[PDB]
Amino acid sequence: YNNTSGEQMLIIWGVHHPNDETEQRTLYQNVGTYVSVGTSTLNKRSTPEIATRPKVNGQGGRMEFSWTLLDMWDTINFESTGNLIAPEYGFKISKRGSSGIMKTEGTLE
Amino acid sequence: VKHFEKVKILPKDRWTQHTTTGGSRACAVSGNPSFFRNMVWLTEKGSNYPVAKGSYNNTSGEQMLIIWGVHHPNDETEQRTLYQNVGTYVSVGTSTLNKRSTPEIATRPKVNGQGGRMEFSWTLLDMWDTINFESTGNLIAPEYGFKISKRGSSGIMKTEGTLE
Ligand SMILES: *[C@@H]1O[C@H](CO)[C@@H](O[C@@H]2O[C@H](CO)[C@@H](O)[C@H](O)[C@H]2NC(C)=O)[C@H](O)[C@H]1NC(C)=O
Numbered sequence A: 001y002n003n004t005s006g007e008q009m010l011i012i013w014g015v016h017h018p019n020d021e022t023e024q025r026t027l028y029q030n031v032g033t034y035v036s037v038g039t040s041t042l043n044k045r046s047t048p049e050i051a052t053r054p055k056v057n058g059q060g061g062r063m064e065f066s067w068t069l070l071d072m073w074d075t076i077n078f079e080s081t082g083n084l085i086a087p088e089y090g091f092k093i094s095k096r097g098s099s100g101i102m103k104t105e106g107t108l109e
Numbered sequence B: 001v002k003h004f005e006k007v008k009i010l011p012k013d014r015w016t017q018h019t020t021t022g023g024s025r026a027c028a029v030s031g032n033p034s035f036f037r038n039m040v041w042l043t044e045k046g047s048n049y050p051v052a053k054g055s056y057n058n059t060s061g062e063q064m065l066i067i068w069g070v071h072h073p074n075d076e077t078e079q080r081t082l083y084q085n086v087g088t089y090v091s092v093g094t095s096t097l098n099k100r101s102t103p104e105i106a107t108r109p110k111v112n113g114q115g116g117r118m119e120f121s122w123t124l125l126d127m128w129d130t131i132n133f134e135s136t137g138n139l140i141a142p143e144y145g146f147k148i149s150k151r152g153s154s155g156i157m158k159t160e161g162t163l164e
């Protein structure tokens, strides 16, 4: 994706780490897989790690999630032989400014 | 941390598969070879270096420091001796933690006459969470890991001197 938006675009991608070779084969149909992302200011290569873990949400498999901020006119490249969880989207920045994240259990009035 | 409570989560004896005996000349005490008392160096039995699996689910009521290590051989034959298999790996996991390291084989300079190296990573197990081990080789296991007894404000003072 070449970024034409006029602003910076936050972008997120993921990589699956399965619980067995059986998962890996039944999904990705092969092994030794990689996920690879790149930009002008970034090149990152990932090698999905298949082990045994405690179920969480009834799951021993996990997903590792990573993000980059793509500058204007740059271009981002995705290549994987398996285990890629790809972005359908990414978010341009329409408005910047002083802001924050407030931690509260409450609600608006 | 003000007090610890050492608790063995992976006894040497109830691990059947490998030979736990190893320790080398670096850890020698008065010329007598030794090892890390809290740890276990797993190496094969009879040409077989089978799947090494482990688990602990933490009852203890306060959290647990746990350490492990991964062996890095000087040479291919150093590797082949102990673990019997090439392209081995170590994998540890928890609810929050997942790690898998692939051991590295290269010729490295002499420090205490050694081209072998050992790399320790550690975690804090919370309440009720389970820690799992899996290895095709090169693992250095905890026998025990540390329950915290006393929480509290303390420090580590750097000093050469000694208590009076
Ligand atoms: C990504 O696309 C943009 C526009 O689609 C490219 O910007 C143009 O690049 C060409 C070739 O150098 C120039 O002739 C135009 O003047 C550029 N237009 C603008 C508005 O910058 C951009 O070069 C592309 N990315 C890469 C890596 O080439």
Ligand SMILES: *[C@@H]1O[C@H](CO)[C@@H](O)[C@H](O)[C@H]1NC(C)=O
Pocket: B057, B058, B128, B129, B130
């Ligand atoms: C560990 O033991 C506690 C005791 O009830 C339990 O709540 C927890 O689910 C156990 N962990 C596993 C592996 O189920």
